[PDB]
Amino acid sequence: MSSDPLQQVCDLIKGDLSLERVRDIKEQLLKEKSVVEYQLNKESDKYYGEVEESLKLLNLSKNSVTSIKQQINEVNKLGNDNRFAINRYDILFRATKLYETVNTTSSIYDRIYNFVALMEHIERLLVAELAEDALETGCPHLLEIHFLLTSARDFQEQVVVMAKEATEDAQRTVMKLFSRLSGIISKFDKLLDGLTYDIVEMARAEQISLAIRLFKIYDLEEREDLRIEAIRNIIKKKEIEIEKSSIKKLPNSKNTARLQDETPKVIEYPTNKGLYQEIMSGTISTRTAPRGYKHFLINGINNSISEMFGEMREKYVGDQKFDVLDNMDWIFNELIIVKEHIANCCPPHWNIFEVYFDQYYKELHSLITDLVESEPETIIILDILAFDKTFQDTLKQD
């Protein structure tokens, strides 16, 4: 062979007729094949067991997962048992007669659109409470989240105004829109005056053991509730992109449509083909959608209230030459205290721990400009920002 004649040279490195050294050279080949079969032995074994678990789980999930979706044939075909049978009574008069008055929400919309006008005109000051804190509103979990649910009752005029898009009448969002002027933006912005003044009140050096507790509790309740709410509306365009773009974009239309689909395939038509994936039924069901910026879009102003207070504490001179990170890193210490104090306050949102590293963008970007050129003390240029690099590292998690 092309190896064997070369191996005839390797054993022709023993002489020409060299039967003793041919024997020993064969023992060398036995050493080579010996270790090559030790590693090829165990390596082949590991590959074989990999094939064993591979076909063992292709087996175990072919059969068992075929009986997991076919266990969904068992239990989900068991779902089809009592389709027109269950609840042993007049369910036909429960879903078409007793649920006919569920299509009769008129007087609740008149006294609650009217009371949403007047009482949120009152909650444009009462649930928009400020001046100064008195526990941040006082009590912005009462106050600013009262403006959140008052804006969730006016999410009928904010988020379910985008669900009631020509449902049955014309003044449901027009005569109630002047009832939403003091109703929606006097509750949502009341929750945003209470939310920007909540996180701004949480940007107030304590801030406080009950002020940031209530205020941040509103800014995690309506923050994460707003996140699952607009995530239920973006999953109404993603559950409609899952659903109506499995209907309009089946593809069997096959034009598709002009021009309420592509765009907006798939949204696709509110009340209820574009709404009921965030509306009834729908056990949520509005989606909420309070408050949008409790700290759902207003937790950036808390870590940017220590990273805008921190970046604001630069005083770019640098007030001796590099005292930007003195007050800025002091606002980073207040960013750790306000951060851990606010995670002690609010688990879901409102500056859990990002105020520290946001203030490290404030001290990082701040110290990368006070001595950018030789405009600071050039003999004390790297010692200052490096001393706050390693020291302000050692003053935190580093």
Partner: protein
């Protein structure tokens, strides 16, 4: 055990059967549906007038509520049985965890894990380039031992040495 059960049906439930069945005429007359946006527009709010639809609706609340004497314990039963689609389809989503994700990707991927790094793709060659080499060790151990022995000690016993020279003809063949 016969387990003779005495619920409240066929005397209670006849009020659900007959008085909530007024919706054939009462619910079709007031027409309280399509949509719940009457006084959101602040126009009519009746409309008109959801009293007979509240005679059938309240006949579901009271006449099928007095029928719900022991049937508000027993309408009240597929809260753990109409969730059969909730026990399975998420299990089908778990199966979609297992099959749309874990069977295909564990199949072709957990298949393709033990790959080259065998390695064998080197080493089985290195086994072969040992093995055949060791073959041409031992065969050349044979022929070089053969003609020196056969002509030497099998001087006498002819036609036993014919075997040996045949094997040298093969080993050098």
């Amino acid at each position: 055990e016969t387990q003779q059960s005495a619920m409240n049906s066929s005397l209670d439930h006849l009020q659900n059967d007959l008085n909530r069945i007024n919706l054939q005429w009462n619910r079709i007359l007031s027409d309280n549906t399509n949509p719940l946006e009457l006084a959101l527009a602040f126009l009519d709010d009746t409309s008109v007038g959801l009293g007979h639809r509240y005679e059938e609706f309240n006949q579901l609340k009271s006449q099928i509520g007095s029928h719900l004497q022991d049937v508000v314990n027993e309408h009240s039963q597929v809260f753990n049985t109409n969730v059969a689609s909730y026990g399975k389809a998420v299990s089908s989503i778990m199966q979609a965890q297992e099959q749309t994700l874990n069977l295909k990707n564990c199949l072709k991927e957990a298949n393709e894990k033990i790959t080259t790094d065998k390695g064998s793709l080197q080493e089985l060659n290195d086994n072969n380039l040992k093995y055949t080499k060791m073959i041409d060790v031992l065969v050349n151990i044979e022929e070089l031992l053969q003609i020196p022995e056969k002509i030497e000690e099998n001087i006498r016993k002819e036609n036993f040495h014919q075997v040996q020279i045949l094997l040298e003809r093969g080993f050098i063949l």
